[PDB]
Amino acid sequence: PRRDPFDAARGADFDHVYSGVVNLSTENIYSFNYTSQPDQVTAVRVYVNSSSENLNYPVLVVVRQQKEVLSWQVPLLFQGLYQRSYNYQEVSRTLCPSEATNETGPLQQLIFVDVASMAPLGAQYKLLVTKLKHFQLRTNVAFHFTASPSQPQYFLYKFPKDVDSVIIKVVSEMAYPCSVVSVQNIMCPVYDLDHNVEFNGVYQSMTKKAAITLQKKDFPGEQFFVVFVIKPEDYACGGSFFIQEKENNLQRKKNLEVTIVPSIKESVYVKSSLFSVFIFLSFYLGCLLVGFVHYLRFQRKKYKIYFWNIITIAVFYALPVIQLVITYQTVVNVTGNQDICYYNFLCAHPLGVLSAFNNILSNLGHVLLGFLFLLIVLRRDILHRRALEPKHFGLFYAMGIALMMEGVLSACYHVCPNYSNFQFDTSFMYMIAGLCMLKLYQTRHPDINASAYSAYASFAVVIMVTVLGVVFGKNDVWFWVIFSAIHVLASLALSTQIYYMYMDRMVLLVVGNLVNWSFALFGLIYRPRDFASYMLGIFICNLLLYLAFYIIMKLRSSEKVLPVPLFCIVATAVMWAAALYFFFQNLSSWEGTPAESREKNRECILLDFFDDHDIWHFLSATALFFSFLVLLTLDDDLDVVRRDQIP
Amino acid sequence: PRRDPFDAARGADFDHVYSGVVNLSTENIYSFNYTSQPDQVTAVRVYVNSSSENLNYPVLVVVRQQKEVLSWQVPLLFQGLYQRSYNYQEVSRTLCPSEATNETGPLQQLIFVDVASMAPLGAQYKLLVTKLKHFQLRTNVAFHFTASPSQPQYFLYKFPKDVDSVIIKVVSEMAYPCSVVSVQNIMCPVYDLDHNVEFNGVYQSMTKKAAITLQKKDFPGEQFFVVFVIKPEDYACGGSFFIQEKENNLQRKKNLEVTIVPSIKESVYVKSSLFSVFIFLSFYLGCLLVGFVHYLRFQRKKYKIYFWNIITIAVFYALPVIQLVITYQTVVNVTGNQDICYYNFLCAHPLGVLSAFNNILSNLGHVLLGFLFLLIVLRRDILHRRALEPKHFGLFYAMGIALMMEGVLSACYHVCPNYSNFQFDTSFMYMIAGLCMLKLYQTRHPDINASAYSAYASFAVVIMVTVLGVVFGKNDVWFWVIFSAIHVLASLALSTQIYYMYMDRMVLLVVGNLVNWSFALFGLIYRPRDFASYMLGIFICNLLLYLAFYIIMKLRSSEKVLPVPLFCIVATAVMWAAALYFFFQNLSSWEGTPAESREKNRECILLDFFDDHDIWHFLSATALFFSFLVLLTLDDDLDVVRRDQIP
Ligand SMILES: CCCCCCCCCCCCC/C=C\[C@@H](O)[C@H](CO)NC(=O)CCCCCCC
Ligand SMILES: CCCCCCCCCCCCC/C=C\[C@@H](O)[C@H](CO)NC(=O)CCCCCCC
Ligand SMILES: *[C@@H]1O[C@H](CO)[C@@H](O[C@@H]2O[C@H](CO)[C@@H](O)[C@H](O)[C@H]2NC(C)=O)[C@H](O)[C@H]1NC(C)=O
Ligand SMILES: *[C@@H]1O[C@H](CO)[C@@H](O[C@@H]2O[C@H](CO)[C@@H](O)[C@H](O)[C@H]2NC(C)=O)[C@H](O)[C@H]1NC(C)=O
Ligand SMILES: *[C@@H]1O[C@H](CO)[C@@H](O[C@@H]2O[C@H](CO)[C@@H](O)[C@H](O)[C@H]2NC(C)=O)[C@H](O)[C@H]1NC(C)=O
Ligand SMILES: *[C@@H]1O[C@H](CO)[C@@H](O[C@@H]2O[C@H](CO)[C@@H](O)[C@H](O)[C@H]2NC(C)=O)[C@H](O)[C@H]1NC(C)=O
Ligand SMILES: CC(C)CCC[C@@H](C)[C@H]1CC[C@H]2[C@@H]3CC=C4C[C@@H](O)CC[C@]4(C)[C@H]3CC[C@]12C
Ligand SMILES: CC(C)CCC[C@@H](C)[C@H]1CC[C@H]2[C@@H]3CC=C4C[C@@H](O)CC[C@]4(C)[C@H]3CC[C@]12C
Ligand SMILES: CC(C)CCC[C@@H](C)[C@H]1CC[C@H]2[C@@H]3CC=C4C[C@@H](O)CC[C@]4(C)[C@H]3CC[C@]12C
Ligand SMILES: CC(C)CCC[C@@H](C)[C@H]1CC[C@H]2[C@@H]3CC=C4C[C@@H](O)CC[C@]4(C)[C@H]3CC[C@]12C
Ligand SMILES: CC(C)CCC[C@@H](C)[C@H]1CC[C@H]2[C@@H]3CC=C4C[C@@H](O)CC[C@]4(C)[C@H]3CC[C@]12C
Ligand SMILES: CC(C)CCC[C@@H](C)[C@H]1CC[C@H]2[C@@H]3CC=C4C[C@@H](O)CC[C@]4(C)[C@H]3CC[C@]12C
Ligand SMILES: CC(C)CCC[C@@H](C)[C@H]1CC[C@H]2[C@@H]3CC=C4C[C@@H](O)CC[C@]4(C)[C@H]3CC[C@]12C
Ligand SMILES: CC(C)CCC[C@@H](C)[C@H]1CC[C@H]2[C@@H]3CC=C4C[C@@H](O)CC[C@]4(C)[C@H]3CC[C@]12C
Ligand SMILES: CC(C)CCC[C@@H](C)[C@H]1CC[C@H]2[C@@H]3CC=C4C[C@@H](O)CC[C@]4(C)[C@H]3CC[C@]12C
Ligand SMILES: CC(C)CCC[C@@H](C)[C@H]1CC[C@H]2[C@@H]3CC=C4C[C@@H](O)CC[C@]4(C)[C@H]3CC[C@]12C
Ligand SMILES: CC(C)CCC[C@@H](C)[C@H]1CC[C@H]2[C@@H]3CC=C4C[C@@H](O)CC[C@]4(C)[C@H]3CC[C@]12C
Ligand SMILES: CC(C)CCC[C@@H](C)[C@H]1CC[C@H]2[C@@H]3CC=C4C[C@@H](O)CC[C@]4(C)[C@H]3CC[C@]12C
Ligand SMILES: CC(C)CCC[C@@H](C)[C@H]1CC[C@H]2[C@@H]3CC=C4C[C@@H](O)CC[C@]4(C)[C@H]3CC[C@]12C
Ligand SMILES: CCCCCCCC/C=C\CCCCCCCC(=O)O
Ligand SMILES: CCCCCCCC/C=C\CCCCCCCC(=O)O
Ligand SMILES: *[C@@H]1O[C@H](CO)[C@@H](O)[C@H](O)[C@H]1NC(C)=O
Ligand SMILES: *[C@@H]1O[C@H](CO)[C@@H](O)[C@H](O)[C@H]1NC(C)=O
Ligand SMILES: *[C@@H]1O[C@H](CO)[C@@H](O)[C@H](O)[C@H]1NC(C)=O
Ligand SMILES: *[C@@H]1O[C@H](CO)[C@@H](O)[C@H](O)[C@H]1NC(C)=O
Ligand SMILES: [Ca+2]
Ligand SMILES: [Ca+2]
Ligand SMILES: [Zn+2]
Ligand SMILES: [Zn+2]
C-alpha cells in the first residue's frame, strides 16, 4: 500500500478557512509548516465545522505531528444522564506545544491534517488552523476568554524567580454552564477532555467562582498548564438538565476571566500569630493587675469526681474526631480533589500539611478564656473552703470545660468542613447540658414536687426532635410540623419556667412569649438548615432572656449590684451584639454542592489573614466568657446577710 | 486535495501478518471488509509491533470505522511517579462492536487502518487484525486470558431471562502487576485506558482477587462490558518499584481467570433472618420456662440518676456516628468507587441501600442478650428493695448498657469499614470503664488508703499510651518501647492488685506474671496493628483471669457455690474458647491497601449467608453475657449467713 502524502498534501496557510466535501472515495490532506524560535512558545489551534445532517456519517479528523497523533469526529456526541443525547457541530483543539531551548536552536515543525468520511453521497466541512498569540499568562493581569463543551481551553504559566506561591482566581459573570478548572504539569499529553481531566493535576468544579493555591516547589521546571473544561449538563453542579436558550444551534458558551496573583509572605503569619496571642494574654495581665491592686489597697486598708468524670468524657470524645479529621486532611492532600473540604478558598492560608491555618489559629480565644475562667472558679472555691474551715461550683467547672472543648472541637471541624462533622461539636453541648441539668435537679431534690417536672420532658422532646430531623430531611409538611412543634415547645417551656419562679410576673411572661413568637417568625422567613444548631441557639437565647428577667427583678430595690456585675453585663451585651453581626456572614455552606458553596467565598479583611468567621470565633469566645462571669458573680450583695447566706 | 483511499487501500485478509516500512513520504493503508449476521456479536482486534530505535520517530496508527475513529502510537510511552518513563513495543486494541438485529438485517462493515511515520530514513512495523471467537461470556463457566499495560481487554455479558443478580469473580495466581476491573454499559465508546477507565461504570483495583455484585434492573438492555486494565506501576496497590523478571523488551503480562455466577434467592434471606431471631429468642423462652418451673415446684413446696446519665451519654455518643455512616454509604452508592469500604466482598449480600446486610443482622445477639441481662438485674434489684422494706447494681446496669452500645456501634461500623471508624467503638469502652472505675473508687471510699491508688495511675498510663499511639505510628524503636511499656504496666498493675487482696498468694502471683509474659511473647510474635484494641483485649483477658483467681480461692473449702455459678463458668469458658477460635480468622483489614485486604476475602459457610466474622459476633455476645452472669451471681451461698450479708 504505497501512498505518498506529499502527492496530495496541499501546502496550507494559517488563518485561512478551507471548505470541502469528502465521501467514501475521497480524503483530504493538508500540510502546515512553521518554525519555533528559542525562548518563545507557540501554540496551534485547529477548528472544524460540519453541518448537522451528517448524523449517521460523521466527519473524522486526524492531526499528525512528529511524536503525537490526535483524532476526533464532527459532530461531537455527548450522552446524558437520563437517556438523552447532545450533538455539537463546531470542534476546536489546541495542540501540545514543544518548547525551544537556546542549546537546541530554532526547530522546524510540520503538521498533517486528514479529513475523511464514509458518507455515500458526501459530507461538507470547514477547517481553520491558527496560531495563538495569547498563550502565556502574566502575573496580576486579568485575561478574558470563552469556552464550550466541545472547545476546551488551556494556557501556560511560568513561575517568576522571586515568587514562591501563587493563587489562580477564576470568575464568571453567570453560572449554568458549570465547568472544571484543572492544573497540570508541562509534559504532554494534556488531559483536556471530560472523561480524563480529573486524573493528573488538581481540579475544582466551578459555576461562578474558583480559587486554587499552588507552591513552586511542587512543579519541576516552575511552569504549569491551566485547563478549563465545560460540562454538557449541570447535574453535578446543583442544576437540572439542559437549559435551552434561544440561540441553542447547540452551544454552551461560558465567558471566563482568569487572574494569577502572588501570595502573602511569612511576616504576615508572624504578625497575625503575635496579635492573636497578645490580644488574649491581655486578659490574664489585666486580671493579675487588678488582683495586685486589690491586695495592695483593700487588704492593707466533693466536686472532684464531678470534675474527673467530665475530663474523662471530654478526652474520650475528642480523640476519635481528631483521628477522623487527620484522615480527611491526608486524603485531601494526597488525591488532589478539592471538592471534599468546604473551605473559604479566597482566604485559606496553608502551613505545612495544613490547608487553612488561620481558621484553626482563630480558636485560641475559646481555650485561653476557658482556662482563665477555670482558674477564677478554682480561686473562689479555694477561698470559700479556707474561710469555711457557693454550692454549684461543679456547674461552673463544667461550663469552663465546655468552653474549652467547644474551642477544641471547632478547631477539629475546621480542618476539613463537609457535611459529616458538625454533628460532633453540636452534640457534645447537648450531652454536657443534659448532664448538668440532671445533676442540678438531683441536687435540688424533689422537696415539694419540685416545680412540675418540665425539664426532662423538654429534654426528651429535644431528643426525638433531633431523631426526627435525622429521619426526615426537608420532607414535605413534616418540616413545618416539627418546626412549629419545637417553637411551641420552647414557648410553653419558658412560660412554665417563668410562672413557677405581681404584675411583673405576667408582664415578663407576655414579653417572653412575644420574643419566642418573633423567633418563630424569623424562622419562618429563613428555613433552618440544621435542627440541632437551631435548637441550641434558641436554647441559649432563651437562657439569656431568663437572665435578663432575673436581673430586672433583682433591680427592683430588693437587692443591690456591685461594680463588677454591671460592668460584666454591659460588656456581655456589647460583645453579643458585635458577634451577632458577624454571625450572619456565611462564606461557605455544606447544604449545597461545592460549587454553590464556592460561590459565596470572600476575601479577608483583618491584617490580610482573618475573614468574617475568624472574627466571629473571637467575639463569640469573648461574649461567652463575659456571660459566664455575669452568671457567677451576680449574687454578691446577698453576702451582706451573714449566717449562711444564699449558696 | 483530492485523494482516493481505494487507490492504495490493499484489500487485506484477517489472521494475516503484514510487515512494512513507512517514512515521511510513505503511508500504508489497509482495508478490511466483513459482514455481521443477526443475533450474533463479532469483535475485531488489532495488533501492532514496532522496534525500539523508533524513539523520537514513533509509528502512528489510525483505525477508521463508520461512526468512530481511534488512534495511538508505537512504542507506547508511560510516565512514572518519580520522573521515570517506560516504553512498550507491542500494542493491541478491541474495536467497539455493533450488534445486528433481525429487523435491521445483516450489515456489511468496512474498516480502514492507516500506518504513518515521520522518520527521515524509515520505520518498520508489523500488523495483524483478527476476529474474536471468545467474546461473549457464559454463566458459571470460567474463562482464562492474559492482559498487558498496553493491551487492555474487555468482554460482553448478557443477563439470562431468569437470573436477577450476578457476581463477577476475578482471580489471578500472582500480584505485581496490579490491575483494575470495571463494569460499564453497552453504548460506545468503551473506556479501556489508564486515564479514563474510572469514569463511567463500577470499578475495583485488584491484585489477586476481585468480586463485584450487579443487579439486572440497573442496566438497560440487560447486558454489560467487563473491562480489565493493567497498571504501569504497583504504587497504588501497596507495591514498590515495578518488578522486572529475568526474561524481560518491557512487558508486564498478567494471567487472569474470570467467572460469573448467579446470586442467592430471597428464601435464604428469610431463613437466615428467622434463624438469627429464634436462636436468641430461645434464651428468653428458657428463662421464662425456668422461672415458671421454680414457681410451680419451689414456691409450692438512688441508682436512677446513674442510669439516666449513662443513657444520655450513650445516645449523644451514638447519633453522630449514625449520620457519618449514612453519609459514607450514600457516597459509596452514588460514586461507584468500591475501594472506600473494606467489606468481605465474597459474602456481602445487599438489601435495599445496604451493601452488607449480613454483617449488620449478625449483631442482634448483643442487643437481645443485653436486654435480657438488664431485665434480670432489674428483677434482682426490685426483689431486694421489696425484701428490705446487692450494692453495685449500678455497675451491672452499666455493663448492660455497654453491651447495648457495643452492639449498636459495631453495627454502625460494619456499614462501611475503613480507617476512620474503629476508634469510636474502641473509645466508648474506655470511657465506660473509666467512669465505672471512678464511681467504684469513690463509693468504696479511701478508708485506709484505699489500696495504693494503682487504678488511676494505670488509667493515666493508658491515656498517654493511647495518645502516643495516635502520635507515632510504627515509628522505629518507639513501637517496641510502647509495647514493652504497656506489657510491664499490666504486669505490675496485676501484681499489685492481687497482692493487696499464704503460699497460694505467691503461686497465683507467679502464675499471673507468667501469663502476662506469655502475652508479651505473643505480641512479640505478631505485631499489634492497633494499640487501643490491643490494650482492651489485654485488660479483658486479665480481668477474667483475675476472676479465675477469685473463684479458685473461693473454692478452698471456706465457701461453696450453687448450680448456677458453676454452670455459668463452664458455659463462659467453652464459649470463650469457641469465640477465640473464630476471632483469629481475619477476612479483611484496613492496615493495607484495598487490594491487599481483598486478597483475604473468603466465602461464607453457615446457611450460605454468614461468614466467620458473623460467627465471631454471635459467640462473643454469648460469652460476654455468660461472663456477666458469672460476675453477678457468684456470691449466693453466703446468703445462708443472715443479718446483713455481703452487699
Ligand atoms: C445549663 C447550664 C449551662 C450549660 C452550658 C453548656 C451549653 C451552653 C453552650 C456552651 C458554649 C458553646 C457555644 C455555643 C454555640 C456556638 O459555638 C455555635 C456556633 O458555632 N452554635 C450556635 O448555635 C450559635 C450560638 C447561638 C447564639 C444565640 C444568640 C446569642
Ligand atoms: C470494669 C468493670 C466492667 C466494665 C464493663 C465495660 C467495659 C468492658 C468491655 C465490655 C465488652 C466490650 C466488647 C469487647 C471486645 C470486642 O467487641 C472487640 C472486638 O470487636 N475488642 C477486643 O479487644 C476483642 C476481645 C478480646 C478478648 C480477649 C480474650 C478473652
Ligand atoms: C463521492 O464519491 C463518488 C464516487 O463514489 C465520486 O465520484 C467520482 O469521484 C472521482 C474521485 O476524484 C472523480 O474523479 C470522478 O469524476 C467522480 N465521478 C463523477 C461522476 O463526478 C465523487 O467525486 C465523491 N464526491 C466528492 C465531493 O468528491
Ligand atoms: C464555524 O461556525 C461558527 C459559528 O457559526 C463561525 O463563527 C463565526 O465567525 C465569524 C467570523 O468569520 C463571526 O463573525 C461570527 O460571529 C461567528 N459566529 C458565532 C460566534 O456564532 C465560524 O466562522 C465557522 N467556521 C470555522 C472555521 O470555525
Ligand atoms: C523514505 O523516503 C524516501 C524519500 O523521502 C523514499 O524514497 C523514494 O520513495 C518513493 C516513494 O516511496 C520511491 O518511488 C522512490 O523510488 C524512492 N527513492 C529511492 C532512491 O529509492 C523511500 O522510498 C522511503 N522509504 C521507503 C521504505 O519507502
Ligand atoms: C509481535 O511480537 C510478539 C512478541 O515478540 C509476537 O508474539 C509471538 O508470536 C509467536 C507466534 O507468531 C509465538 O510463537 C511467540 O511465543 C510470541 N512471543 C511472545 C508471546 O513473547 C507477535 O507474533 C509479534 N507480531 C504481532 C503482529 O503481534
Ligand atoms: C517556613 C515558614 C512558613 C516559616 C514562617 C514562620 C511561622 C510558620 C511560625 C512563626 C511563629 C509561629 C507561631 C508562634 C506561636 C504559636 C502559638 C502556639 O500556641 C501554637 C503555634 C504558634 C501559632 C506558631 C505557629 C507557627 C508560626 C506562625
Ligand atoms: C472574687 C471575685 C469577685 C473575683 C472576680 C474576678 C475579677 C478578678 C475579674 C472579673 C472581670 C475581670 C475584668 C474583665 C475585663 C477586663 C478588661 C481587660 O482589657 C483587662 C482586664 C479586665 C479589667 C478584667 C480584670 C479582672 C476582672 C475584674
Ligand atoms: C486543651 C488544649 C491543650 C487542646 C489543644 C488542641 C490542639 C493542640 C490540637 C486539636 C486539633 C489538632 C489538629 C487536628 C488535626 C491535624 C491535621 C494533621 O495533618 C496536622 C495536625 C493537626 C492540624 C492538629 C494540630 C493540633 C490540634 C490543633
Ligand atoms: C487509603 C485509602 C484507600 C482510604 C480511603 C478513604 C477515602 C478514599 C474516603 C474516606 C472519607 C471519604 C469521603 C467522606 C465524605 C465525602 C464528602 C462528600 O461530599 C463526597 C465524598 C467524600 C469526599 C468521601 C470520599 C472518599 C473518602 C475521602
Ligand atoms: C435509639 C436510637 C439510636 C435509634 C435511632 C434509629 C434511626 C437512626 C434509624 C431507625 C430507622 C432508620 C431508617 C429506616 C429506613 C430508611 C429508608 C432508607 O431509604 C433511608 C434510611 C432510612 C430513613 C433509615 C435511617 C435511619 C433510621 C431512622
Ligand atoms: C441555621 C442553623 C443551621 C444554625 C443557626 C441557628 C441559630 C443559632 C439561629 C437561628 C435563629 C436565630 C435567632 C433568630 C432571631 C433572633 C432575634 C434577634 O433580635 C437576635 C438574634 C436572634 C435571637 C437569633 C439568634 C441565632 C438563632 C437562634
Ligand atoms: C444581645 C443582643 C440582644 C444585643 C443587641 C443585638 C443587636 C444590636 C443586633 C442583633 C441583630 C443584629 C442585626 C442582624 C442582621 C443585620 C443585617 C445585616 O445586613 C447588617 C447587620 C444587621 C442589621 C445586624 C446589626 C446588629 C443587630 C441589630
Ligand atoms: C423485595 C425483596 C428484597 C423482599 C424480600 C424480603 C426480605 C428482604 C425481608 C423478609 C423478612 C424480613 C425481616 C423480618 C424481620 C426482621 C427483624 C427486625 O428486627 C429487623 C428487620 C428484619 C431483619 C427483616 C428484614 C427484611 C426481611 C429479611
Ligand atoms: C435470681 C437469680 C438466681 C437469677 C438467675 C437467672 C436464671 C433464671 C437464668 C441464668 C442463666 C439462664 C440460662 C442461660 C442459658 C440457657 C440455655 C438455653 O438453651 C435454655 C435456657 C438457659 C438454660 C437459661 C435459663 C435461665 C437461667 C438459668
Ligand atoms: C437500642 C436498639 C433499639 C438500637 C437499634 C439500632 C439499629 C436499628 C440502627 C442503628 C444503626 C442503623 C443503621 C445506620 C445506617 C444506615 C444506612 C442507611 O442508608 C440505611 C439505614 C441504616 C442501615 C441504619 C439501619 C438501622 C440501624 C441498624
Ligand atoms: C488533649 C488531647 C486531645 C491533645 C492531643 C494532641 C494531639 C492530637 C496532637 C498534638 C501534636 C500533634 C502533632 C503535631 C505535628 C505533627 C506532624 C505532622 O507531620 C503530622 C501531624 C502531627 C503528628 C500532629 C498530630 C496531632 C498531634 C499529635
Ligand atoms: C491486633 C489488635 C489490632 C486487636 C487484637 C488485640 C487483642 C484483642 C488480642 C491481642 C493479643 C491477644 C491474646 C494473646 C494471647 C492469649 C493467650 C491464649 O492462651 C489465649 C488468647 C489470648 C488471651 C489472646 C486474646 C486476644 C488478644 C488480647
Ligand atoms: C479462656 C481461654 C483461656 C480458654 C481456652 C482457649 C483455647 C481453647 C483457645 C485460645 C487460643 C486458640 C487457638 C488460636 C489459634 C489457633 C490457630 C488455628 O490455625 C487453629 C486453632 C488455634 C490453635 C486456636 C485453638 C483454640 C485456642 C487454643
Ligand atoms: C483549639 C485550637 C488551638 C490552636 C492552637 C495553635 C494551633 C497550632 C497547630 C499546629 C501548628 C504546627 C502543626 C502544623 C503543621 C505541622 C507541619 C510543620 O509545622 O512543619
Ligand atoms: C444492633 C443492630 C441490630 C440490627 C437489627 C436489624 C437491622 C435492620 C436494619 C434495617 C432494615 C430495613 C432497612 C434496610 C434498607 C431499607 C430499604 C428497603 O427495605 O427498601
Ligand atoms: C518548511 O519550510 C521551510 C522554509 O522554507 C522549508 O525549508 C522546508 O522544506 C519546509 N518543509 C517541508 C516539508 O516542505
Ligand atoms: C539562551 O541563550 C540566549 C543567548 O543569549 C539567552 O539570551 C537566553 O536567556 C538563554 N535562555 C535562558 C533560559 O537563559
Ligand atoms: C465487501 O464485500 C462485499 C461482499 O462481496 C462486497 O459486496 C462489497 O462491495 C465489499 N466492500 C467494498 C467497499 O468493496
Ligand atoms: C429475530 O428474528 C429471528 C428469526 O427467527 C429470531 O430467531 C430471533 O430470535 C429474533 N431476535 C430476537 C432478539 O428475538
Ligand atoms: Ca500533563
Ligand atoms: Ca460506555
Ligand atoms: Zn466555626
Ligand atoms: Zn465486627
Residue numbers in the entry:
A (entry chain B), B (entry chain A): 35 to 282, 286 to 338, 440 to 527, 539 to 650, 685 to 830
Task: Give sentences from the paper.
The mammalian integral membrane proteins SIDT1 and SIDT2 are classified into a superfamily of putative metal-dependent hydrolases called CREST (alkaline ceramidase, PAQR receptor, Per1, SID-1, and TMEM8), in which alkaline ceramidase 3 and adiponectin receptors were reported to possess intrinsic ceramidase activity. Moreover, SIDT1 and SIDT2 sharing sequence similarity with Caenorhabditis elegans cholesterol uptake protein 1 (CEL-CHUP-1) were revealed to participate in cellular cholesterol transport.
Despite of similar domain organization, the structures of hSIDT1pH7.5 and hSIDT1pH5.5 assume distinct conformations. Significant changes occur in the TMD of each protomer, particularly in TM5 and TM6, which lead to an open form for hSIDT1pH7.5 and a closed form for hSIDT1pH5.5, triggering rearrangement at the dimer interface (Supplementary Discussion S3). The Zn2+ is coordinated by residues His563TM4, His798TM11, His800TM11 and a water molecule stabilized by residue Ser559TM4. A striking cholesterol-like density was observed in the extracellular juxta-membrane region at the dimer interface, which can be perfectly fitted by a cholesterol molecule. Additionally, the cholesterol density near the extracellular juxta-membrane in hSIDT1pH7.5 is absent in hSIDT1pH5.5, suggesting that cholesterol has already departed from this site at low pH. Interestingly, another cholesterol molecule, which binds close to the central cavity and interacts with SPL in hSIDT1pH7.5, undergoes a noticeable outward and downward movement.
